């Protein structure tokens, strides 16, 4: 069992929307029954998708209305997480753990580009 | 299903032993065929135990010959990480992760104390 990243590195632009995606062997046909997918930057609940079913409250404040799990593509063997609105905060490793019988993860940097007076925003934030 | 950890600290001399726990229930006997266990930190493979063995081709070099897994707690759920002659290295963020059924995986943070002569080097 093997988890791969198509890009290990994504380059986006603050205010857009991005979509990284882990990768899974399905064969050809999903066992829903037997998937745990769970994406987490830094030790932040992004995503914690059991029995089918994304588990929503204990998805972490900072992306709470803004991370969803593509579910359509998972037939696919493809876990999509989408964030809209990206901040400069979501710069960092995120990580993609996948339960399938086996068990892998992956790691993608996320890079954020952002003009002067949002990352001054931030540098008064942080 | 949970994974917990009696101690998410600790403080350990240069060149002892240390051993860090990890719990995850077992209710009725252990299953192996179903049980893996993956220690990892930052992000250096420490150890694999997968198809009830250990699997030491992904182990990352600075800790071969250096970590083991205490097999027989398993049955008691407890996946204990044996480091042995720990180094200056060896401190940081460890994550055992553990997929028995459901999964789950807890933080451990390893602080090494260490003398002059060894932090010098
Ligand atoms: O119920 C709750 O609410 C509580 C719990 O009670 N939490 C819920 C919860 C549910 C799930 Cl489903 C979860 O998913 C873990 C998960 C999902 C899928 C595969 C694995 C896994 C396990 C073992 C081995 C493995 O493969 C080894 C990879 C080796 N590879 C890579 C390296 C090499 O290149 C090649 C080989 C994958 C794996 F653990 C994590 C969770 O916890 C959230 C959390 C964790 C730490 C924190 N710290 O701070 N806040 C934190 C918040």
């Given at each position: 069992?093997?988890?791969?990243?198509?890009?290990?590195?994504?380059?986006?632009?603050?205010?857009?929307?991005?979509?990284?995606?882990?990768?899974?062997?399905?064969?050809?046909?999903?066992?829903?029954?037997?998937?745990?997918?769970?994406?987490?930057?830094?030790?932040?609940?992004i995503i914690?998708?059991?029995?089918?079913?994304?588990?929503?409250?204990?998805?972490?404040?900072?992306?709470?209305?803004?991370?969803?799990?593509?579910?359509?593509?998972?037939?696919?063997?493809?876990?999509?997480?989408?964030?809209?609105?990206?901040?400069?905060?979501?710069?960092?490793?995120?990580?993609?753990?996948?339960?399938?019988?086996?068990?892998?993860?992956?790691?993608?940097?996320?890079?954020?580009?952002?003009?002067?007076?949002?990352?001054?925003?931030?540098?008064?934030?942080?």
């Amino acid at each position: 069992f093997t988890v791969t990243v198509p890009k290990d590195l994504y380059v986006v632009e603050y205010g857009s929307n991005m979509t990284i995606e882990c990768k899974f062997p399905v064969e050809k046909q999903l066992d829903l029954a037997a998937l745990i997918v769970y994406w987490e930057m830094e030790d932040k609940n992004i995503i914690q998708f059991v029995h089918g079913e994304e588990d929503l409250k204990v998805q972490h404040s900072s992306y709470r209305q803004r991370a969803r799990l593509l579910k359509d593509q998972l037939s696919l063997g493809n876990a999509a997480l989408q964030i809209t609105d990206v901040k400069l905060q979501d710069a960092g490793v995120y990580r993609c753990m996948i339960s399938y019988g086996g068990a892998d993860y992956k790691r993608i940097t996320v890079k954020v580009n952002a003009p002067y007076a949002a990352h001054h925003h931030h540098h008064h934030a942080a």
